[PDB]
Assembly symmetry: C2
């Protein structure tokens, strides 16, 4: 077969939005945190153009929460991340790389500080819940760790702001990037952050009252018509062009923050203690020997289902291409590659096998645009 069906089960969890997106034209799924996440609503290029010009509503329920509350919650949260959260404030979001005893990445979540003793970790694709529960028991912390009933719906694109003002009023227009607050929809208060996995702008509604959230979803489609609202999902071309890097895809647990361009979130000269702090000091001293870079390959098509070695002018492996797509902006293929320090340099050339043909490519900086 060219395509394989996804086999549904209780274990591969549906969302509060599933029956709706399946009537609105979802054509492919990925799995993220043991949950269905839409991967396409037809053409990925057309979804990208629509996202950059209009507004979309996304089922991103699979961006699960780990809720950590109780006396040692602030501390357990800070143990897990190399980002300094000592001056953190209620109502703010912070991108906090989670790292292990080796200094290697576990997850790149957004942390929401709801209160001094209550923390939501909005996670990428790995079971941070169990890392937390492991660390809590091992370090003897007094916390409560749950996956709460929270199912995110995103509102993304340049028309997101006008659409959400229409629904929630002028108060939501005051929300700064990566702030959150509580907003009323027909009696129910919903936590809404100004965040989301694009650079086109918008919001994420952290739906706890599921029924009210489903009615809100339906309402956004009804009063969004004048804005050309439509369904969507995180967009492959957008995430590569803007270097919105994802755990499991661009980097994984054999990679450290310094190989992924996360230098500014690794806070080594505080007195806060987090995992692998010592090992990350050594890495920052000797410097990394490999790093995520962009690449361009002058072909009009690619379908990356997995990794692919890239080779030098002698046919020695100089890196690994990890994500890639056709970019209409460049009218060629662009990607994210973990490349050896020998070939880091913006403009450095390389060779890669696409089918049975060597083809040339070149390294570039991230983001692409």
């Amino acid at each position: 077969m060219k395509n394989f069906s996804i086999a549904k089960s209780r274990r591969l969890r549906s969302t509060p939005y599933t029956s709706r997106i399946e009537k609105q034209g979802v054509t492919a799924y990925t799995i993220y945190n043991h949950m269905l996440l839409p991967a396409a609503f037809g053409s990925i290029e057309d979804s990208y153009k629509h996202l950059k010009e209009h507004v979309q509503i996304w089922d991103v329920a699979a961006e699960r929460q780990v809720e950590i509350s109780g006396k040692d919650s602030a501390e357990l949260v800070q143990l897990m991340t190399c980002r300094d959260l000592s001056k953190s404030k209620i109502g703010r979001c912070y991108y906090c790389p989670i790292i292990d005893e080796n200094g290697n990445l576990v997850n790149d979540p957004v942390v929401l500080k709801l209160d001094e003793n209550k923390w939501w970790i909005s996670i990428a694709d790995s079971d941070v819940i169990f890392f937390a529960k492991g660390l809590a028991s091992g370090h003897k912390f007094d916390v409560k760790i749950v996956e709460p009933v929270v199912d995110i719906m995103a509102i993304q694109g340049p028309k997101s702001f006008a659409l959400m003002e229409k629904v929630f009023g002028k108060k939501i227009t005051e929300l700064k990037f990566f702030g959150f607050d509580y907003f009323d929809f027909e009696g129910t208060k919903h936590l809404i952050a100004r965040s989301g996995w694009s650079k086109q702008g918008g919001y994420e509604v952290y739906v706890e009252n599921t029924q009210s959230g489903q009615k809100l979803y339906d309402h956004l489609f009804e009063v969004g018509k004048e804005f050309n609202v439509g369904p969507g999902c995180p967009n492959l071309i957008e995430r590569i062009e803007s270097a919105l890097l994802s755990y499991g895809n661009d980097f994984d647990n054999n990679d450290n923050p310094f190989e992924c361009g996360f230098d500014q979130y690794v806070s080594l000269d505080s007195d806060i203690n987090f995992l692998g702090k010592e090992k990350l000091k050594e890495i920052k001293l000797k410097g990394p020997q490999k790093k995520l870079r962009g690449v361009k390959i002058d072909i009009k098509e690619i379908s990356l289902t997995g990794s692919k070695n890239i080779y030098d002018e002698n046919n020695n492996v100089i890196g690994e291409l990890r994500s890639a797509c056709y970019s209409p902006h460049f009218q060629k293929v662009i990607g994210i590659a973990m490349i050896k320090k020998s070939h880091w340099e913006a403009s450095q050339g390389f060779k890669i096998q696409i089918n049975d043909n060597t083809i040339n490519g070149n390294v570039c900086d991230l983001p692409f645009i």
Copy 2:
């Protein structure tokens, strides 16, 4: 809206068998431990008839390993599970439920004791690696925790015994259920366990030397024609008929081993140290307020994608149906349901809404065959 395509990417990992099984008729996939696991090779009823009569070779690489080695490995392994490993032997497998701070199920793996100081945890669908790494950090255990390069290939069905004899000779026929040993294929030694996710008989080859395991895979298809060998995967009908439970489907992290029939595997009155031991002492005295049970329901067809409430005569919720299929053996739908204390009783009637018809069903004991 009926079947949906899966979107492949690096993050949904492929396996050493992917290119082979996509030439042998795989039609559907699930995702298991962030990895492709075949869900169908065409009709589920026909794969089922074939498994029960003949022999199949399965890609089950998604049954990943957590390898824990070093001086504190035995202790860390035991800390994660309720099952008593104090008398454990090299060359044996053990079903070892992993339990958290609430006494609830994290994963239900098989543990393989390779050495006093080297352990493989063969995992269900959750990231046990990070629970282990969390525990190890707190207790400052002297251990190394990695996911090794191990990609299980299974041989299952009544003809598995004879096919493996053909390849490996008499010594494989000596291997007892849940034992493992090392067996020579073309000069390479492979760890092979007598185990796997059917009740139809067979083996799991824990392939570390991938190129040799790929050659072995192709060899099995050649010298297995005598036994009508074919491709396959864990079979939904077979596994419900045999009451083989799965983490995420029948039970999850809100469930404790006393609710799932894991009583024989919980060691409360030994001296072993493990998480939630006290909670499980509490829980076992009070007793389970709900348990897993069999159900049989009078329709010839179902598509379970999620929990489905089952009701008494007067529309009260007595349970939740979690796995279900049409059983060609019963010529009707059977399933596994988590049922309230009030309605446990073997033969209790109930009703379930499936589209435009209310359907009679009743509770029964496990297994079915």
